[PDB]
Swiss-Prot record:
Exists either covalently attached to another protein, or free (unanchored). When covalently bound, it is conjugated to target proteins via an isopeptide bond either as a monomer (monoubiquitin), a polymer linked via different Lys residues of the ubiquitin (polyubiquitin chains) or a linear polymer linked via the initiator Met of the ubiquitin (linear polyubiquitin chains). It is found in: Cytoplasm; Nucleus; Mitochondrion outer membrane. Phosphorylated ubiquitin specifically binds and activates parkin (PRKN), triggering mitophagy. Phosphorylation does not affect E1-mediated E2 charging of ubiquitin but affects discharging of E2 enzymes to form polyubiquitin chains. It also affects deubiquitination by deubiquitinase enzymes such as USP30. Mono-ADP-ribosylated at the C-terminus by PARP9, a component of the PPAR9-DTX3L complex. ADP-ribosylation requires processing by E1 and E2 enzymes and prevents ubiquitin conjugation to substrates such as histones. It comes from the Eukaryota. There is a cross-link at S2 (Glycyl lysine isopeptide (Gly-Lys) (interchain with K-? in acceptor proteins)). The modification ADP-ribosylglycine is found at S2. It is a peripheral membrane protein. This is Ubiquitin. The lineage of its organism: Eukaryota, Metazoa, Chordata, Craniata, Vertebrata. The gene is UBB. Residues 3-73 form the Ubiquitin-like domain.
Length: 73
């Protein structure tokens, strides 16, 4: 399956991203690189005050459709 989330950067810019529940966090970082040109080695992803850890999945963190991730490069 699929869902649309948001990724919000410290600049205020917020982008849509199309993910799957099964996706690992490092897979999400790969999608960000495809859309925005930020390599995964310059990304950290935060949901609701926790840093998302690469080897876990979105579903492991209770990410819902239309949730917003904050990123730090």
């Amino acid at each position: 399956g699929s869902m649309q989330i948001f990724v919000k950067f410290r600049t205020g810019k917020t982008y849509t991203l199309e993910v799957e529940p099964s996706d690992t966090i490092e897979n999400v970082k790969a999608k960000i690189q495809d859309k925005l040109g930020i390599p995964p080695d310059q990304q950290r992803l935060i949901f609701a005050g926790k840093q998302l850890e690469d080897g876990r999945t979105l579903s492991d963190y209770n990410i819902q459709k239309e949730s917003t991730l904050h990123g730090v490069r």
